[PDB]
Amino acid sequence: IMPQHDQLHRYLFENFAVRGELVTVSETLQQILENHDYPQPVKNVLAELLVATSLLTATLKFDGDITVQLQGDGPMNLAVINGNNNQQMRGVARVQGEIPENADLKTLVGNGYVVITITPSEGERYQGVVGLEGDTLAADLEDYFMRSEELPTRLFIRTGDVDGKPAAGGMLLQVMPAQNAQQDDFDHLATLTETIKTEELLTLPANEVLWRLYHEEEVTVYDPQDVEFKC
């Protein structure tokens, strides 16, 4: 009973009113990077977007589409993943200039934002525009969620190489809404998961990674879910 391939799982911390999710998108990635000749720095934000988008997605009670993009006046005007609630993802980047060998994100992009737009099959749409104050996409998103959302959320995104092939995964924690969850416990959990090793995350069976961190906790593991490339 053990294969190999991208997946995202959900879990809730019973006595803590905080849910979390771990995910790997290294395969669906190989697919999005292939065909282009993208500089390291770009293959990175994308791995970064990809994961981010994934996790956002898995957290929203919807059904339809969503695009997450990075806009601005960098050499890379554009970068965007597109995916739905069935975690089927694809994306492209948009290079138009000089790209500094070891490029930073503020450097990689303009003064742009991140746009999160959702278009659910049947109903109103949702726009989320977050500025790039913070220095990590993962950060800007947490912060967005602090401000424009008032829901504490932490993103843990690791990017790297497994078997020469680039590979990416990530983790999420976030206050369960209107259940009065004590910031504390969370900070602890966050403190706990910060320790996660890109290495572990990317090569180690999720169930184990979850154990290695949350074993001492009352966890409720929901059914997993695939993540995959689209057309």
Side-chain angles (χ1 to χ4, degrees):
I1 55 194
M2 48 132 286
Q4 248 283 81
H5 77 271
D6 288 9
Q7 249 186 155
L8 178 132
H9 348 38
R10 285 182 196 57
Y11 43 80
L12 167 50
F13 294 86
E14 285 302 331
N15 320 293
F16 269 140
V18 183
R19 42 173 303 202
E21 36 182 44
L22 158 159
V23 63
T24 26
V25 297
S26 318
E27 209 170 299
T28 295
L29 196 63
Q30 349 236 63
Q31 273 160 72
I32 291 171
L33 292 191
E34 103 181 12
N35 273 322
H36 319 92
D37 197 43
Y38 279 154
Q40 264 319 166
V42 192
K43 292 196 302 318
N44 289 293
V45 286
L46 277 172
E48 276 208 57
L49 262 205
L50 180 49
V51 163
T53 302
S54 209
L55 293 173
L56 284 342
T57 298
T59 42
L60 295 186
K61 270 249 169 138
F62 78 112
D63 199 285
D65 297 343
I66 174 180
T67 83
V68 149
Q69 44 216 301
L70 271 214
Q71 276 181 336
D73 45 48
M76 184 172 84
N77 44 301
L78 185 49
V80 58
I81 316 305
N82 300 265
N84 48 31
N85 81 290
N86 283 322
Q87 227 78 38
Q88 305 184 306
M89 306 271 118
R90 183 196 18 102
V92 338
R94 220 38 108 182
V95 201
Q96 57 166 185
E98 209 60 16
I99 272 178
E101 143 147 315
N102 286 174
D104 164 34
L105 207 221
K106 301 311 172 12
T107 315
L108 277 149
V109 172
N111 288 296
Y113 301 84
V114 216
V115 164
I116 299 173
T117 129
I118 312 166
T119 142
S121 57
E122 177 223 44
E124 63 202 89
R125 317 296 216 238
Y126 289 110
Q127 197 70 304
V129 180
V130 50
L132 333 166
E133 318 317 275
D135 46 21
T136 288
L137 158 67
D140 316 275
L141 280 170
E142 324 181 43
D143 155 280
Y144 171 82
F145 264 92
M146 212 21 121
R147 329 293 198 63
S148 213
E149 282 314 322
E150 320 186 67
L151 192 195
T153 303
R154 307 269 287 96
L155 302 184
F156 301 101
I157 319 177
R158 324 243 137 315
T159 64
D161 283 41
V162 178
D163 289 345
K165 303 181 199 297
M171 265 183 273
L172 179 164
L173 298 159
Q174 135 173 289
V175 177
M176 294 286 308
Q179 293 166 70
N180 187 69
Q182 289 315 274
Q183 189 61 172
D184 303 313
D185 331 352
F186 188 88
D187 323 309
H188 304 163
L189 273 168
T191 307
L192 234 167
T193 125
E194 257 144 35
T195 61
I196 174 65
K197 281 163 187 184
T198 65
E199 159 53 1
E200 309 183 278
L201 188 41
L202 303 162
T203 63
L204 277 178
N207 71 94
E208 138 125 38
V209 187
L210 289 186
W211 177 69
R212 289 195 179 195
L213 301 166
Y214 311 105
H215 57 354
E216 269 159 331
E217 323 287 354
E218 188 52 58
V219 165
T220 271
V221 171
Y222 293 136
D223 276 64
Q225 173 161 195
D226 274 293
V227 175
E228 32 199 34
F229 196 52
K230 189 169 230 274
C231 164

PDB file of all heavy atoms in Angstrom, residues 209-225:
ATOM      1  N   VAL A 209       5.573  12.315   8.452  1.00  0.00           N
ATOM      2  CA  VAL A 209       6.013  13.651   8.785  1.00  0.00           C
ATOM      3  C   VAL A 209       5.062  14.195   9.825  1.00  0.00           C
ATOM      4  O   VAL A 209       5.486  14.951  10.739  1.00  0.00           O
ATOM      5  CB  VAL A 209       6.025  14.619   7.583  1.00  0.00           C
ATOM      6  CG1 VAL A 209       6.660  15.877   8.067  1.00  0.00           C
ATOM      7  CG2 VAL A 209       6.787  13.994   6.352  1.00  0.00           C
ATOM      8  N   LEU A 210       3.790  13.802   9.699  1.00  0.00           N
ATOM      9  CA  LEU A 210       2.826  14.390  10.628  1.00  0.00           C
ATOM     10  C   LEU A 210       3.082  13.837  12.025  1.00  0.00           C
ATOM     11  O   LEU A 210       2.989  14.488  13.073  1.00  0.00           O
ATOM     12  CB  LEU A 210       1.423  14.049  10.219  1.00  0.00           C
ATOM     13  CG  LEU A 210       0.872  14.721   8.967  1.00  0.00           C
ATOM     14  CD1 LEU A 210      -0.544  14.271   8.976  1.00  0.00           C
ATOM     15  CD2 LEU A 210       0.763  16.216   8.980  1.00  0.00           C
ATOM     16  N   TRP A 211       3.359  12.548  12.029  1.00  0.00           N
ATOM     17  CA  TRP A 211       3.654  11.918  13.306  1.00  0.00           C
ATOM     18  C   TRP A 211       4.901  12.591  13.904  1.00  0.00           C
ATOM     19  O   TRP A 211       4.884  13.056  15.045  1.00  0.00           O
ATOM     20  CB  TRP A 211       3.802  10.394  13.097  1.00  0.00           C
ATOM     21  CG  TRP A 211       4.177   9.689  14.337  1.00  0.00           C
ATOM     22  CD1 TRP A 211       3.411   9.506  15.460  1.00  0.00           C
ATOM     23  CD2 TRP A 211       5.483   9.270  14.697  1.00  0.00           C
ATOM     24  NE1 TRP A 211       4.162   9.002  16.503  1.00  0.00           N
ATOM     25  CE2 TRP A 211       5.462   8.943  16.079  1.00  0.00           C
ATOM     26  CE3 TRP A 211       6.709   9.322  14.051  1.00  0.00           C
ATOM     27  CZ2 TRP A 211       6.589   8.500  16.758  1.00  0.00           C
ATOM     28  CZ3 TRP A 211       7.853   8.925  14.744  1.00  0.00           C
ATOM     29  CH2 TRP A 211       7.776   8.475  16.067  1.00  0.00           C
ATOM     30  N   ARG A 212       5.994  12.589  13.153  1.00  0.00           N
ATOM     31  CA  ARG A 212       7.237  13.099  13.691  1.00  0.00           C
ATOM     32  C   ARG A 212       7.036  14.496  14.326  1.00  0.00           C
ATOM     33  O   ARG A 212       7.881  15.016  15.060  1.00  0.00           O
ATOM     34  CB  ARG A 212       8.287  13.229  12.589  1.00  0.00           C
ATOM     35  CG  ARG A 212       8.909  11.980  11.985  1.00  0.00           C
ATOM     36  CD  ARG A 212      10.174  12.320  11.195  1.00  0.00           C
ATOM     37  NE  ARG A 212      10.815  11.139  10.626  1.00  0.00           N
ATOM     38  CZ  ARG A 212      12.065  11.070  10.123  1.00  0.00           C
ATOM     39  NH1 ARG A 212      12.895  12.116  10.130  1.00  0.00           N
ATOM     40  NH2 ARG A 212      12.556   9.895   9.711  1.00  0.00           N
ATOM     41  N   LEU A 213       5.933  15.160  14.019  1.00  0.00           N
ATOM     42  CA  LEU A 213       5.795  16.465  14.610  1.00  0.00           C
ATOM     43  C   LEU A 213       4.635  16.439  15.580  1.00  0.00           C
ATOM     44  O   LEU A 213       4.776  16.779  16.754  1.00  0.00           O
ATOM     45  CB  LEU A 213       5.543  17.506  13.514  1.00  0.00           C
ATOM     46  CG  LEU A 213       6.492  17.796  12.341  1.00  0.00           C
ATOM     47  CD1 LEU A 213       5.848  18.629  11.206  1.00  0.00           C
ATOM     48  CD2 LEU A 213       7.702  18.530  12.853  1.00  0.00           C
ATOM     49  N   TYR A 214       3.481  15.991  15.123  1.00  0.00           N
ATOM     50  CA  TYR A 214       2.323  16.157  15.981  1.00  0.00           C
ATOM     51  C   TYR A 214       1.947  14.924  16.787  1.00  0.00           C
ATOM     52  O   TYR A 214       0.874  14.876  17.363  1.00  0.00           O
ATOM     53  CB  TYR A 214       1.151  16.691  15.158  1.00  0.00           C
ATOM     54  CG  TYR A 214       1.526  17.902  14.284  1.00  0.00           C
ATOM     55  CD1 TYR A 214       1.690  17.777  12.901  1.00  0.00           C
ATOM     56  CD2 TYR A 214       1.515  19.188  14.788  1.00  0.00           C
ATOM     57  CE1 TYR A 214       1.851  18.889  12.068  1.00  0.00           C
ATOM     58  CE2 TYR A 214       1.897  20.308  13.984  1.00  0.00           C
ATOM     59  CZ  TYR A 214       2.104  20.154  12.623  1.00  0.00           C
ATOM     60  OH  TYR A 214       2.507  21.261  11.878  1.00  0.00           O
ATOM     61  N   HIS A 215       2.890  14.026  17.037  1.00  0.00           N
ATOM     62  CA  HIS A 215       2.503  12.769  17.686  1.00  0.00           C
ATOM     63  C   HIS A 215       1.854  12.924  19.040  1.00  0.00           C
ATOM     64  O   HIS A 215       1.197  12.004  19.533  1.00  0.00           O
ATOM     65  CB  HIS A 215       3.722  11.908  17.937  1.00  0.00           C
ATOM     66  CG  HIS A 215       4.762  12.587  18.756  1.00  0.00           C
ATOM     67  ND1 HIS A 215       4.658  13.915  19.115  1.00  0.00           N
ATOM     68  CD2 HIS A 215       6.018  12.206  19.079  1.00  0.00           C
ATOM     69  CE1 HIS A 215       5.775  14.301  19.705  1.00  0.00           C
ATOM     70  NE2 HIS A 215       6.626  13.289  19.669  1.00  0.00           N
ATOM     71  N   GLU A 216       2.151  14.048  19.675  1.00  0.00           N
ATOM     72  CA  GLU A 216       1.760  14.186  21.063  1.00  0.00           C
ATOM     73  C   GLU A 216       0.442  14.900  21.032  1.00  0.00           C
ATOM     74  O   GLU A 216       0.055  15.468  22.039  1.00  0.00           O
ATOM     75  CB  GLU A 216       2.783  15.009  21.867  1.00  0.00           C
ATOM     76  CG  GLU A 216       3.883  14.155  22.532  1.00  0.00           C
ATOM     77  CD  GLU A 216       5.205  14.857  22.940  1.00  0.00           C
ATOM     78  OE1 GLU A 216       5.710  15.887  22.362  1.00  0.00           O
ATOM     79  OE2 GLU A 216       5.855  14.200  23.802  1.00  0.00           O
ATOM     80  N   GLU A 217      -0.223  14.937  19.886  1.00  0.00           N
ATOM     81  CA  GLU A 217      -1.412  15.762  19.793  1.00  0.00           C
ATOM     82  C   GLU A 217      -2.587  15.001  19.297  1.00  0.00           C
ATOM     83  O   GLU A 217      -2.457  14.147  18.430  1.00  0.00           O
ATOM     84  CB  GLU A 217      -1.227  16.839  18.751  1.00  0.00           C
ATOM     85  CG  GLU A 217       0.159  17.448  18.662  1.00  0.00           C
ATOM     86  CD  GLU A 217       0.349  18.337  19.856  1.00  0.00           C
ATOM     87  OE1 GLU A 217      -0.677  18.455  20.553  1.00  0.00           O
ATOM     88  OE2 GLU A 217       1.504  18.711  20.157  1.00  0.00           O
ATOM     89  N   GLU A 218      -3.738  15.588  19.586  1.00  0.00           N
ATOM     90  CA  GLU A 218      -4.996  14.934  19.295  1.00  0.00           C
ATOM     91  C   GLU A 218      -5.370  15.376  17.915  1.00  0.00           C
ATOM     92  O   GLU A 218      -6.029  16.420  17.725  1.00  0.00           O
ATOM     93  CB  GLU A 218      -6.087  15.406  20.253  1.00  0.00           C
ATOM     94  CG  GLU A 218      -7.413  14.642  20.179  1.00  0.00           C
ATOM     95  CD  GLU A 218      -7.239  13.132  20.292  1.00  0.00           C
ATOM     96  OE1 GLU A 218      -6.677  12.626  21.294  1.00  0.00           O
ATOM     97  OE2 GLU A 218      -7.646  12.447  19.333  1.00  0.00           O
ATOM     98  N   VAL A 219      -4.968  14.511  16.981  1.00  0.00           N
ATOM     99  CA  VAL A 219      -5.179  14.784  15.552  1.00  0.00           C
ATOM    100  C   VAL A 219      -6.275  13.971  14.864  1.00  0.00           C
ATOM    101  O   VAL A 219      -6.437  12.743  15.015  1.00  0.00           O
ATOM    102  CB  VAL A 219      -3.865  14.748  14.750  1.00  0.00           C
ATOM    103  CG1 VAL A 219      -4.167  14.663  13.262  1.00  0.00           C
ATOM    104  CG2 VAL A 219      -3.069  16.015  15.092  1.00  0.00           C
ATOM    105  N   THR A 220      -6.923  14.696  13.966  1.00  0.00           N
ATOM    106  CA  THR A 220      -8.022  14.135  13.211  1.00  0.00           C
ATOM    107  C   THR A 220      -7.592  14.268  11.766  1.00  0.00           C
ATOM    108  O   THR A 220      -7.412  15.391  11.268  1.00  0.00           O
ATOM    109  CB  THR A 220      -9.319  14.906  13.537  1.00  0.00           C
ATOM    110  OG1 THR A 220      -9.956  14.291  14.669  1.00  0.00           O
ATOM    111  CG2 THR A 220     -10.331  14.719  12.454  1.00  0.00           C
ATOM    112  N   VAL A 221      -7.221  13.126  11.187  1.00  0.00           N
ATOM    113  CA  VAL A 221      -6.793  13.139   9.791  1.00  0.00           C
ATOM    114  C   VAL A 221      -7.919  12.808   8.804  1.00  0.00           C
ATOM    115  O   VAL A 221      -8.379  11.684   8.761  1.00  0.00           O
ATOM    116  CB  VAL A 221      -5.587  12.223   9.537  1.00  0.00           C
ATOM    117  CG1 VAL A 221      -5.361  12.119   8.058  1.00  0.00           C
ATOM    118  CG2 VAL A 221      -4.406  12.878  10.059  1.00  0.00           C
ATOM    119  N   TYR A 222      -8.251  13.755   7.935  1.00  0.00           N
ATOM    120  CA  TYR A 222      -9.319  13.639   6.959  1.00  0.00           C
ATOM    121  C   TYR A 222      -8.746  12.900   5.775  1.00  0.00           C
ATOM    122  O   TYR A 222      -7.520  12.787   5.720  1.00  0.00           O
ATOM    123  CB  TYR A 222      -9.654  15.069   6.555  1.00  0.00           C
ATOM    124  CG  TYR A 222     -10.249  15.828   7.700  1.00  0.00           C
ATOM    125  CD1 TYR A 222      -9.842  17.143   7.982  1.00  0.00           C
ATOM    126  CD2 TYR A 222     -11.304  15.254   8.442  1.00  0.00           C
ATOM    127  CE1 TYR A 222     -10.491  17.890   8.991  1.00  0.00           C
ATOM    128  CE2 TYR A 222     -11.952  15.981   9.457  1.00  0.00           C
ATOM    129  CZ  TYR A 222     -11.534  17.293   9.748  1.00  0.00           C
ATOM    130  OH  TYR A 222     -12.164  17.968  10.787  1.00  0.00           O
ATOM    131  N   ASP A 223      -9.563  12.579   4.772  1.00  0.00           N
ATOM    132  CA  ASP A 223      -9.069  11.905   3.582  1.00  0.00           C
ATOM    133  C   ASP A 223      -8.208  12.800   2.727  1.00  0.00           C
ATOM    134  O   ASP A 223      -8.458  14.018   2.632  1.00  0.00           O
ATOM    135  CB  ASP A 223     -10.243  11.428   2.755  1.00  0.00           C
ATOM    136  CG  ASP A 223     -10.735  10.116   3.263  1.00  0.00           C
ATOM    137  OD1 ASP A 223     -11.193  10.152   4.425  1.00  0.00           O
ATOM    138  OD2 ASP A 223     -10.273   9.040   2.820  1.00  0.00           O
ATOM    139  N   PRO A 224      -7.119  12.241   2.191  1.00  0.00           N
ATOM    140  CA  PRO A 224      -6.133  13.037   1.430  1.00  0.00           C
ATOM    141  C   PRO A 224      -6.707  13.523   0.117  1.00  0.00           C
ATOM    142  O   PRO A 224      -7.915  13.467  -0.124  1.00  0.00           O
ATOM    143  CB  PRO A 224      -5.016  12.040   1.135  1.00  0.00           C
ATOM    144  CG  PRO A 224      -5.682  10.741   1.235  1.00  0.00           C
ATOM    145  CD  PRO A 224      -6.715  10.833   2.356  1.00  0.00           C
ATOM    146  N   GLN A 225      -5.839  13.967  -0.776  1.00  0.00           N
ATOM    147  CA  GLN A 225      -6.381  14.510  -2.002  1.00  0.00           C
ATOM    148  C   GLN A 225      -5.292  14.720  -3.010  1.00  0.00           C
ATOM    149  O   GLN A 225      -4.156  15.035  -2.635  1.00  0.00           O
ATOM    150  CB  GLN A 225      -7.003  15.852  -1.709  1.00  0.00           C
ATOM    151  CG  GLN A 225      -7.390  16.471  -3.010  1.00  0.00           C
ATOM    152  CD  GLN A 225      -8.409  17.545  -2.768  1.00  0.00           C
ATOM    153  OE1 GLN A 225      -9.078  17.996  -3.708  1.00  0.00           O
ATOM    154  NE2 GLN A 225      -8.507  17.988  -1.508  1.00  0.00           N
TER     155      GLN A 225
END
